[PDB]
Amino acid sequence: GKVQIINKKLDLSNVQSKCGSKDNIKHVPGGGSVQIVYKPVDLSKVTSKCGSLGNIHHK
Amino acid sequence: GKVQIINKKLDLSNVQSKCGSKDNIKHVPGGGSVQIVYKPVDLSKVTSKCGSLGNIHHK
Amino acid sequence: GKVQIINKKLDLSNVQSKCGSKDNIKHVPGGGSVQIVYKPVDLSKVTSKCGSLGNIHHK
Amino acid sequence: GKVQIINKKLDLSNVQSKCGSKDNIKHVPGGGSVQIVYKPVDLSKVTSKCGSLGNIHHK
Amino acid sequence: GKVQIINKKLDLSNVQSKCGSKDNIKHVPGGGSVQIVYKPVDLSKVTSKCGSLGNIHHK
Amino acid sequence: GKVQIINKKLDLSNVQSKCGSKDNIKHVPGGGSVQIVYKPVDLSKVTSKCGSLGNIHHK
Numbered sequence: 188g189k190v191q192i193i194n195k196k197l198d199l200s201n202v203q204s205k206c207g208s209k210d211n212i213k214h215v216p217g218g219g220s221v222q223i224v225y226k227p228v229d230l231s232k233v234t235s236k237c238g239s240l241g242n243i244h245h246k
Numbered sequence: 247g248k249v250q251i252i253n254k255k256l257d258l259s260n261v262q263s264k265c266g267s268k269d270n271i272k273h274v275p276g277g278g279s280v281q282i283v284y285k286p287v288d289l290s291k292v293t294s295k296c297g298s299l300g301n302i303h304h305k
Numbered sequence: 306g307k308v309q310i311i312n313k314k315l316d317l318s319n320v321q322s323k324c325g326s327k328d329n330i331k332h333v334p335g336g337g338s339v340q341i342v343y344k345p346v347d348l349s350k351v352t353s354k355c356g357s358l359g360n361i362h363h364k
Numbered sequence: 365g366k367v368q369i370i371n372k373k374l375d376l377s378n379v380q381s382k383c384g385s386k387d388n389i390k391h392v393p394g395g396g397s398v399q400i401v402y403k404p405v406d407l408s409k410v411t412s413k414c415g416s417l418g419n420i421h422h423k
Numbered sequence: 424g425k426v427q428i429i430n431k432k433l434d435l436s437n438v439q440s441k442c443g444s445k446d447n448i449k450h451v452p453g454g455g456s457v458q459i460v461y462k463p464v465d466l467s468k469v470t471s472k473c474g475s476l477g478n479i480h481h482k
Numbered sequence: 483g484k485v486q487i488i489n490k491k492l493d494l495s496n497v498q499s500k501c502g503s504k505d506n507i508k509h510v511p512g513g514g515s516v517q518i519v520y521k522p523v524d525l526s527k528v529t530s531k532c533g534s535l536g537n538i539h540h541k
Contacts, residue, residue, distance in 0.1 A: 217280035276339035335398035365424040394457035444503040453516035478493035
């Protein structure tokens with residue numbers, strides 16, 4: 188009678204990245220009173236080398 | 247009688263990236279009172295490489 | 306009777322990138338009172354390379 | 365007696381990029397009172413190379 | 424009886440890019456009171472290259 | 483008997499780009515009061531090379 192065939196292959200990916208990240212004072216609603224005092228002296232050399240943010244295949 | 251065939255391949259990707267990231271004082275609704283005092287002195291060298299933000303194939 | 310054949314390949318991508326990024330004072334609704342005081346002296350060299358933001362094939 | 369054949373290949377890409385990125389004071393609705401004071405002194409050399417923002421094939 | 428054949432091969436892209444980008448004081452609805460005071464002395468060299476923003480083939 | 487054959491091969495692209503980019507004070511609806519003071523003293527040297535904003539093929 189009837190015949191049916193299905194093949195699927197399915198990749199789904201969702202990548203958020205920050206190579207070498209620094210994040211400061213990230214959220215301040217400020218209800219009532221808040222005070223923040225911070226220095227630093229950073230002198231910063233940053234190096235970062237992110238890999239493929241990906242779906243990837245080889246050879 | 248009747249025949250149906252399907253083949254699929256599907257790759258779906260969503261990507262967000264920052265390379266060498268510095269993020270500062272990121273959200274301040276400030277509904278009452280806020281004070282922030284911050285330096286730094288950065289003296290900063292940043293180097294960064296981001297790989298393929300991608301769907302990718304080799305050989 | 307009836308024969309039907311389908312092949313699909315689909316790559317779907319959404320990408321955002323910031324190579325070398327510094328992001329400052331990103332959102333201030335400031336609904337009451339806010340004060341922010343910030344320096345720095347950056348003295349800054351930035352180098353960045355972003356790879357393919359892509360769907361990509363080689364060989 | 366009926367036959368149907370379909371082949372599809374589809375790439376769909378949406379890309380946004382910055383190379384050598386800096387963002388400052390990105391959004392200020394400022395509905396009450398806000399004061400921001402910021403320097404920097406940058407001395408900034410920026411070098412950047414954004415690769416193919418693309419659908420791409422080689423060899 | 425009826426034979427039908429379809430082939431499709433489609434690349435679709437949407438791209439936005441800013442090589443070397445500095446973006447300052449990006450959006451200020453300023454609905455109450457805002458004061459922003461900012462320098463810099465930038466002393467700045469910028470060099471940038473953007474690769475093909477494209478659908479691309481090399482053989 | 484009735485036969486139909488279709489082939490399509492399509493590249494479609496939309497691109498916006500800037501090279502050596504700087505954007506200053508991009509949008510100020512200023513619905514209450516705003517004051518901004520910002521220099522820069524830049525000494526700016528800029529070099530830039532945007533590649534093909536295109537659908538492209540070689541060899």
